[PDB]
Amino acid sequence: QLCLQCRSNSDCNIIWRICRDGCCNVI
């Protein structure tokens, strides 16, 4: 559970590209 503050869809890295509840998900 790494709620990485996201923005658009994959505003994080190659790992987390699922900008879920304001966070980046790897799913």
Protein described:
It is classed as unknown function. Keywords: cystein-rich peptide, unknown function. The assembly is monomeric. With 27 residues, the chain is an all-beta fold. The protein has one domain (1-27). The protein contains no helices and three strands. The protein has strands spanning 4-5, 18-20, 23-25. It is globular and about 15 Å long.
Count of individual helical segments: 0
Strand order of the largest sheet: 1-3-2
Structural class: mainly beta
Largest sheet: 3 strands, antiparallel
Could you spell the SSE succession in H and E letters? EEE
Q: Can you tell me the number of structural domains? A: 1
Which geometry do the CA atoms define? globular
Helicity range: under 10%
Which percent band covers the strand fraction? 25-35%
What is the count of β-strands? 3
Please tell me how large the radius of gyration is. 7 Å
Distance between the termini: 11 Å
Task: Give short descriptive properties of this protein.
27 residues, mainly beta, three-stranded antiparallel β-sheet, 0% helix, unknown function, cystein-rich peptide, monomeric
List the helices and strands and how they pair.
Elements: E1 4-5, E2 18-20, E3 23-25
Antiparallel strand pairs: 1-3, 2-3
Summarize the structure.
It is classed as unknown function. With 27 residues, the chain is an all-beta fold. It has one domain.
